[PDB]
Structure formats: structure tokens, C-alpha cells
């Protein structure tokens, strides 16, 4: 048995190897292409008026193939780019589950009713402060007076 992340790393770097070897094949075809233009230029001055046409067809065909070698290089890298975000999604899922559990156990401590009871008790005591103080000042200012 192999752990899931072990297979992921192997697959990713196998994709990298495939990209590298596709690049090597493309480079070989570009060297062959340059050889083709060299031969066409050599034969262009010589002439024949048609062998240049056959080699031009061969050259555009080489370009057509290297087009799609680059295309498969992009295709291979695209699936690696897709699989990169998979572990990010898994990490977000696990961390989100953890923070959800933390928030749940935080909310379970003080629920709706007792926090409201604390609220009413504090508000009533704030009522009491103002009543005592304002009554005191009323009575004492009334007693002093004269101004």
C-alpha cells in the first residue's frame, strides 16, 4: 500500500519528466528544421524550381508537428496545475473542519439564555447606579440651594 501523498509526488515529477522529454523531442525537430532551411537555401541558388517546393512542404509539415508537441507539453502541464490545487482544497477542508469545531465548542460555553441574563442583570445594576447617584445629587443640591 502507498499513502495518497506518495503517489501524488511521483505522478507530479513523472509529468515533469514527460515535459522534459517532449522538450527534447521538440528541440531535435527544430534542429532538423534548421537543417531543412539550410538545404533549401543551398538548393534555391541551384534551382530545380520544384525540389524547393517539396522541401517547403516538408518544412511546413515539421512546423505543424512541433506545434502539437508544444501543445502536448501544455496539456501535460495543465493536469499538474489542476492537481496542485487538490491538496490546497483538502488542507482548507481539514482546517475549516477544525475551526468549525473550535467555534462550536466556543459557542457551547455561553449560549443564548444566560448571556441575556447577564445582560439584564448588568443593565439593572446600571439602572441602580443612576438612581442612587441622581437621587443623592438631587437631595443635596435641593438642601444647599440659595443659588
Amino acid at each position: 500500500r502507498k499513502t495518497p501523498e506518495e503517489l501524488l509526488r511521483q505522478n507530479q515529477r513523472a509529468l515533469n519528466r514527460a515535459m522534459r522529454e517532449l522538450d527534447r523531442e521538440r528541440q531535435k525537430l527544430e534542429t532538423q528544421e534548421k537543417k531543412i532551411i539550410a538545404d533549401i537555401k543551398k538548393m534555391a541558388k541551384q534551382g530545380q524550381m520544384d525540389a524547393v517546393r517539396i522541401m517547403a512542404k516538408d518544412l511546413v509539415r515539421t512546423r505543424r508537428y512541433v506545434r502539437k508537441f508544444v501543445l502536448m507539453r501544455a496539456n501535460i502541464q495543465a493536469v499538474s496545475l489542476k492537481i496542485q490545487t487538490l491538496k490546497s482544497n483538502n488542507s482548507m477542508a481539514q482546517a475549516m473542519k477544525g475551526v468549525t469545531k473550535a467555534m462550536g465548542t466556543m459557542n457551547r460555553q455561553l449560549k443564548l439564555p444566560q448571556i441575556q441574563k447577564i445582560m439584564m442583570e448588568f443593565e439593572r445594576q446600571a439602572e441602580i447606579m443612576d438612581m442612587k447617584e441622581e437621587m443623592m445629587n438631587d437631595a443635596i443640591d435641593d438642601a444647599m440651594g440659595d443659588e
Binding site: 495518497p4 514527460a18 525537430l29 517539396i54 493536469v79 487538490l86 483538502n90 459557542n107 443564548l112
Partner: protein, 159 residues
Amino acid sequence: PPKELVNEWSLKIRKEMRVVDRQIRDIQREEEKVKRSVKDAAKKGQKDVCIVLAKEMIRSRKAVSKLYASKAHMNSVLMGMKNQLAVLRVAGSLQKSTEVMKAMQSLVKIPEIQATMRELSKEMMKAGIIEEMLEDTFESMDDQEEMEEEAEMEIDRIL
């Protein structure tokens, strides 16, 4: 094995393309010889036989064109074989990627993550109302329009 046979037959393809190149080279040596013969015929004043010499000039060139077409066609089928090998290997890599894809997605599934969806939604539902209750009870303590105006006046005094 698919990869093994491709390299073998590709190297044979170039082996035979070089033979075709050798044929072209030999015919071009004869090409130079006949061109020199044409030049010799022209200077002698017998311009009439130079027509037959020119027919000789062009027949060999047609043969050269045929051989070059043969070479290009062999090269084309070689490139096609290499292309098919590349496509097959790309498909194999895609299948290998899909295998680990399924293997690593097998752990987390839709139901147990939708349970967390709803759980976080309800926890935040409660947290928001609790925070709003605390904010409202602390803002109910004294007037806000009265204090907020003194706040800008505080800025002038400090500055």
C-alpha cells in the same frame, strides 16, 4: 514495448534516408559531368546536339526530384510515428494522474463536508447575533451623537 520499436524503426528510417541521399549525390556527380559535356558541346558550334544534352540535363533532374520526394515522404511517416508515440505517452500520463486523483480524493467526500458546511453556518449564525447583542448593549450606555461630535473637537486639541 511501444517505445522500443519506435526508436529502432526511426533509426532504420534515417539509415534509408541516407541511402537516398547517397543516390542523389551520385546522380548529381553525373549531373555535373553532363553539364560540363553540355558546355563542351556549346563551344564547339554544334548547338543542335546541345538540345539532346539538355534533355539529358533535365531527365536526371526529374530523377533527383523523385528521390527528394521519396526522402520527404519517409521523413513524414517517421514524424507521424513519433507523434503517435508522444500522444500515447501523454494519454498514459493522464491515466496515471487520474489514478492518484481518485486515490487522494477518496478521503474527503460530499456528505461529511456538507455537514461541516451547515455546522459552520450555524456557528457563525449564533456568533453574529451574540456579537451584535454585545455591541448594542455597550452602545446603549450613553448618547452617541453627543460623544461623536466631541471626538472631532478632540482632534483639534491634540493637533
